[PDB]
Structures are given as C-alpha cells and as structure tokens.
Amino acid sequence: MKQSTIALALLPLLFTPVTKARTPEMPVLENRAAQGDITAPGGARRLTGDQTAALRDSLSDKPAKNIILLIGDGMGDSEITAARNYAEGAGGFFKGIDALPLTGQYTHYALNKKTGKPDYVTDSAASATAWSTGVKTYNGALGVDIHEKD
C-alpha cells in the first residue's frame, strides 16, 4: 500500500512488522564470547576454517604470520612491562584507574564531557548495573591498530 489517500501508507499503523525476516536463527541467540566473530576462531586458532573455502595459508602474511600463532599471546609480561596483560577488564576505564583524562592540569573548564544528558548518552542508568567483575567489555587488540602501531 503506497498512495496519497492515507491507507496507513504515509505511516504504518502496525509498528511491529517482523514479516518473519530471519525468523529466530542467529538474531535470538548470543554467541557468548564471539566464537565465530571478531577474528574467526573464538578460543583456538584452528586455521582449517579457510581450508575448505580455498586455502590454509593463513590469509596473506601480516605480523607474526597473522593471528594463527599456536601459543604466545603475552607479547609483554615476561620481564615487567604489562605485568598482567589486560587484567580481565582489558583496562577499559575504571578497571584501569582513570575517572577523567582530558588535557588541562588544574583546569575547571571540565564539567560537560561525561554529563550524559545532551553531551554523551543516558543519565547514569544506575538501576543496579552491578556485576562489573573486570570483564573484557572494551577493545582488546595489539600488533597493528589505527595508522599501523602496536
């Protein structure tokens, strides 16, 4: 229905279409810790994923012959640098230490760069939250990121 004389064509009266478009297959179930997401193997390296597709030769080359290395994730940690790599929470923000980064020592022009309301998002949303026992809930990568850095 698409014509001038209303007929819910200018505004769908039913606002829940569904239309059985991807009837609960993957959009229903959580992949938990990204088994088939982020890289491709959520745990081991395996390398036999692309084997049946075409090749088993990592992909091309990248640092350390791509992320197919069997064992040796702690590129630091051996001497003293990192100490405990990510430390469960991946640093994150609070699991790190920090409460306000910025660039202004002994400034007071701070205030609104964490307000939430027309400045960031939400107003604390302090309805429980809880259960923040570290948890890798932010970015956790190394080797090469943004303009080519470790």
Binding site: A7, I97, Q105, A128, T129, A130, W131, T133
Partner: protein
C-alpha cells in the same frame, strides 16, 4: 617603548607597539652571533669584516624571524607593566618593516573579564537521600529478570504487561480502509510506538477472543483529519504470550558476572554495587543541580579563545559519534555548540573565581575520601594506588577534581540546598 592602545573588538584591545630600529638592529646582530657559535663561524671569524656590515647584509634574511620573536617578548613585557589581564590569540597585525626605521605593529588581543559572582543564594539544589532495602534490590533484580525474560506462549487470561498475537481490522468511522489491517500481528504493551490505547483491548480479554475496540489515533499520526480521531479496530486476539522470570540458578546468577553468585549473594553483591554507582550518581546529582543553578544565577561573556577551544573539543566529540568520518569536526559551525560551549566555560570561570576569591585549594583529606570511596569497589586496589604514585599527571588531576568538588560545596554553602529521604529508583531514572 612607544605603544598606542585602542579598545577595538570589545575585549580585543589593540596595543600598537613600536619596536625601535636600534632594538631590532641589536636583536638581529645578537641572533647572528648565536648562529655563528652554533655553526662555529665565530671561530672561523677572521675579524676583518665589521659586525654591523654582516648584521644588515647577511642578517637581512634573519630580520623577519627576529621581528616575530620581538613581538612575542614585547607582548609579555607590555601586559605586565601596563597591568593588563590578556586573553585570546594576540592578533599581531605587522606594519611595514622599513630597514633602518621603527617596526610599528598592532597587537589586538582579548582580555579576561574577572567573574562578577552575584548572589549564590539564587542557586537551588536538591539532595535526595536514596534509601535501598531488600524489596528495592529484589524489585530491581526482578526488572532485570524482566529485561532478560524468556517469552513463551500461554492460553487464557491476558495481562497488561504481556505481548500477544492478534489479527485486527483497521477502520475509521466504522469504515475499514485498504492496507488497514494486520493478520497474525504480534503486539507488545507499554511501548509507546503504537497508537495510544490500541493495546488496551488486548490487555483485558482471553486468547480466544474477537472484539472491536474504540481507540483514538495519536496526534503524531500523519493525517490531520485522522490524528486524535476515535477509530474502530476489530482485534482478533488469537494468542497471548507471557514472560518467564528466568531461573535463579547460581550459575545463571553469576552468568552476568555476579562473583558472589548465590541468591542472597545476588541481592548483597548487586546491593553494594548499587550504592557504589549511586555514590558517584548522587555526587553528580547534587553537583549538576549546583552548576545548573550557578550559571542560572550568573552570566559572563567569555573571550573567543576559551569558547572556541570548547567548540573544537565538542566538534570532535560530536563527529566521533556522528559517523567518525575524516575530520568532519573542523567544519561544524561555532553556533552548533556556541550556547552550551560558552555555558561550559562560564562554569569554569565561576568555579575558577571560587578557587581564587575563597583561596580554595585541593584538600588532602578530600583526595583521601575520593580515592578510598572510588576504590571501595575493590578489595585490594594496589593497581589504583600504585598508578597514582607512578603517574603524578593523574595523581594531581585527582586533586584537581577534588578541588572542583570542594569548589561546588563552597557554592552549596550559600545555595538553597534542600534535602529529602527518597525512594530507590529516584536517580535510577532508566529501567527500559
């Protein structure tokens, strides 16, 4: 030092400094011997060529760089003896350098207007003492269990928080219009996406019902003659589906990350986490209403420098979330943020004036209280304490935020800060 000050661009005062030809001639010649020592030409100097000769001829190139140097050193020299309080980027409008004559140039720089702090009694703040009980923590956990509820079919009496399967006839004046139906239509309650009242008919019938309800369209409907018009809908309520409050199994409890993953353990752990977030939330509550009222009590037009600094920060902060595309920030207009950016800097000047006027410093017992209450979430925060003692750039910033908190409280001292013992979900404004 010949200067001629004229107040031009409001706060932007034009101190037209005139650096004498001898001052320039000395400074260029003084620069050339610096270059001579650097490149060791001073040692290779045979001393048969007089220094006044190399100053004008070879130093003709360096004249430019020495002028710009002198403009900066005559600026800081001027503002001190003239007792001016400068601001902004000093617009060095450079007059024509006549080789042998005086270099006149107009330094158009803004000034900082000191903050006329008016009555802080005009500020009105609320301090709501948020109490929590077992009914509050369990009721909130119940809400979270309703967020993570596994919905499944039932049959019989519909309830007012379910979702169902109907099949309605869309009609206006009892006239079914074309397109105006929906068969096997799953409708959910509470969500204000649909027509207001359209869910009503469903919420008080059975899973084997057919009925026509009298519900009024929204005034947000895309037809003026139909917006807020009483319509007919023959709701064929064929099924009803209820949420299942999920299993309170200890493994499901800890699936969220509840480290003390027991039942009373869920209640207790989530409780002490509630209070820790509520600590920072109640602080932000009283502080935000303090700042709201502070600027509501006080007005100041800031120099362009600080406002446009905040503009640029807010442009990057915006464009970061608005796509995150290449440097789109720099094209966002001043007027996009100008009102609220000025407002941010106004607070910075208000509290900055509280620091100065009230000689208010960062108190070490406030730094004590802040660190310990923040790190009270941890059992042993060696990470946090060591990061302070091994990163003083954050440790002084811990004192800077404590400085700002004490500033706010010194303003609250004069402000109309009411207090009340309120319910749990007061600051917990968002449940859905």
């Amino acid at each position: 030092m010949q200067v001629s000050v004229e107040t031009t661009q409001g706060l932007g005062r034009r101190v037209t400094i005139t650096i004498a030809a001898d001052s320039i001639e000395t400074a260029v010649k003084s620069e050339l011997v610096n270059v001579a020592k650097k490149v060791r030409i001073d040692g290779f100097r045979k001393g048969k060529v007089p220094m006044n000769i190399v100053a004008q001829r070879y130093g003709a190139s360096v004249r430019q760089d020495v002028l710009g140097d002198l403009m900066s050193r005559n600026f800081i020299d001027a503002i001190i003896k003239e007792k001016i309080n400068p601001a902004g980027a000093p617009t060095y409008v450079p007059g024509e350098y006549k080789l042998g004559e005086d270099f006149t140039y107009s330094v158009e720089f803004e000034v900082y207007p000191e903050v006329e702090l008016q009555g802080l009694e005009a500020i009105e703040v609320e301090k709501p003492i948020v109490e929590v009980t077992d009914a509050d923590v369990d009721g909130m956990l119940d809400t979270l269990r309703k967020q993570q509820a596994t919905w499944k079919e039932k049959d019989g009496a519909v309830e007012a928080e379910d979702r169902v399967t109907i099949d309605f006839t869309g009609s206006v004046d009892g006239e079914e219009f074309e397109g105006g139906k929906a068969s096997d239509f799953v409708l959910a309650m509470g969500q204000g996406r649909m027509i207001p009242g359209f869910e009503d008919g469903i919420k008080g019938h059975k899973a084997g019902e057919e009925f026509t309800i009298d519900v009024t369209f929204p005034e947000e409907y895309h037809a003026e003659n139909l917006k807020g018009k009483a319509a007919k809908f023959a709701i064929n309520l064929k099924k009803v589906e209820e949420r299942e409050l999920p299993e309170l199994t200890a493994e499901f409890i800890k699936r969220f990350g509840v480290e003390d993953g027991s039942v009373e353990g869920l209640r207790a752990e989530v409780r002490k986490n509630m209070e820790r977030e509520l600590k920072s939330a109640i602080r932000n509550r009283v502080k935000s209403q303090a700042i709201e009222g502070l600027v509501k009590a006080n007005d100041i037009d800031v120099p362009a420098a600080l406002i446009d600094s905040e503009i640029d920060v807010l442009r990057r902060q915006a464009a970061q979330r608005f796509g995150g595309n290449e440097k789109q920030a720099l094209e966002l207009p001043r007027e996009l943020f100008e009102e609220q950016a000025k407002r941010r800097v106004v607070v910075g000047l208000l509290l900055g004036e509280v620091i100065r006027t009230n000689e208010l410093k960062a108190d070490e017992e406030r730094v004590k209280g802040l660190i310990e209450e923040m790190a009270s979430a941890y059992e042993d925060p060696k990470e946090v304490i060591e990061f302070y003692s091994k990163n003083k750039e954050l440790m002084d910033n811990m004192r800077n935020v404590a400085l700002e908190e004490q500033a706010v409280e010194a303003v609250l001292a004069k402000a109309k800060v009411t207090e009340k013992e309120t319910t749990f979900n007061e600051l917990m404004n968002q449940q859905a």
